[PDB]
Amino acid sequence: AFAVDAAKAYKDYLASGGQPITNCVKMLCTHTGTGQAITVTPEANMDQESFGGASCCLYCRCHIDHPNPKGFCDLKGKYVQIPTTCANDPVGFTLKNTVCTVCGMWKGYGCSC
């Protein structure tokens, strides 16, 4: 029955005024991309930065099991677009937000559905 909840631990750590995880790999890009959340290549638009997926996944970064039966990681090997306003904490952003399964934009950060 026992399982470690790293997501809530990091959220509480942030609330406690903690230093956000650093050294997420920001990519060079045109910044004229589709703005979608998770892509096969950097897709940041004028308002986004693109990071290497693995470097912004809490589970990859902390060396813990991914929270699902497959252990599958949806960021590793891809590129994640982060609003420039939140690019200081990409791990926290990806953790706290959700991707629209129809248009592929961040819900509340580019999704107009």
Partner: protein, 297 residues
């Protein structure tokens, strides 16, 4: 300095043709540092400029390309160069990386441990190595050709690089190997490329373009490294991050280069010419299988 707008500077041919003696490397711009775009890591920029330069060579780019990246881990626990390589390579490229220490990677598969423990069944279209041991930079002893991972690399290139494949191996004033320079003579073309963001360093990437599997040119590695040091000593390179700001043409153009299985008897001069122009890769196309030897005790 119109080189400032290029991704870097390649060793001019005339410097390759000299017969210099090894000297200490004393860079005029030593300590200078290019101003990187906000929040961009040095290694992201370095790999980006390396890839921008490779875009100008006749790299074979087959479907289902195979790229292996040694020395991919950083002291941060992530793999910036691997992220840049995945961005640069065509979608669907099989990318394997490795490093002595554990790290988080965007590669299709990652092997941790000494380069010497890595084995692969298949051959590769592109080999990148950023492996570096900072204990080599000792200015109180002779600067002699180094072994260690370099040995491995050489072997790897000769055993597991497809004909027509290419390599970029990082070297410095003290991190170098004579046999690697000698191997450069087994490619259709070769150079030493210095990225503009890291021009203040003796670092360079030994680039071998279009592997031929045999020497087309006899290169003395000691003399060639002395030539490289002479070039760097007499040609100050202006630190520059300009090329980082235009990524519109960054992706490696998918060329669909043909891949043929051939026995060595079949590599005639027509085949060698096709190899030398980046128009042919010679290797099998079975599944990619890799492993890392584990010593038990």
């Amino acid at each position: 300095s119109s080189q400032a707008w290029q991704p870097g500077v390649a060793m001019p041919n005339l410097y390759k043709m000299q017969r210099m003696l090894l000297e200490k490397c004393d860079l005029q711009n030593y300590g200078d540092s290019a101003t990187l775009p906000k929040g961009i890591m040095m290694n992201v920029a370095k790999y980006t400029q390396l890839c921008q330069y490779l875009n100008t060579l006749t790299l074979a780019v087959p479907y289902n390309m195979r790229v292996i990246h040694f020395g991919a881990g950083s002291d941060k626990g992530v793999a910036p160069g691997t992220a840049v390589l995945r961005q640069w390579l065509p979608t669907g490229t099989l990318l394997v990386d490795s490093d002595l220490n554990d790290f988080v990677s965007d590669a299709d598969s990652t092997l941790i441990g000494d380069c010497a423990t890595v084995h692969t069944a298949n051959k590769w279209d592109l080999i990148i190595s950023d492996m570096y041991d900072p204990k080599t930079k000792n200015v109180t002893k002779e600067n002699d050709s180094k072994e260690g991972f370099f040995t491995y690399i050489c072997g790897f290139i000769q055993q597991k690089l497809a004909l027509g494949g290419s390599v970029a191996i990082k070297i410095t004033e003290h991190s170098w190997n004579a046999d690697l320079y000698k191997l450069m003579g087994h490619f259709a073309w070769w150079t030493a490329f210095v990225t503009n963001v890291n021009a203040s360093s003796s670092e360079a990437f030994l680039i071998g373009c279009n592997y031929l599997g045999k020497p087309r040119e006899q290169i003395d590695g000691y003399v060639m490294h002395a030539n490289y040091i002479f070039w760097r000593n007499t040609n100050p390179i202006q630190l520059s991050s300009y090329s980082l700001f235009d990524m519109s043409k960054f992706p490696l153009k998918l060329r669909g280069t043909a891949v043929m299985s051939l026995k060595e008897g079949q590599i005639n001069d027509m085949i060698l010419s096709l190899l030398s122009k980046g128009r042919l890769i010679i290797r099998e196309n079975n599944r990619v299988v890799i492993s890392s030897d584990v010593l038990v005790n």
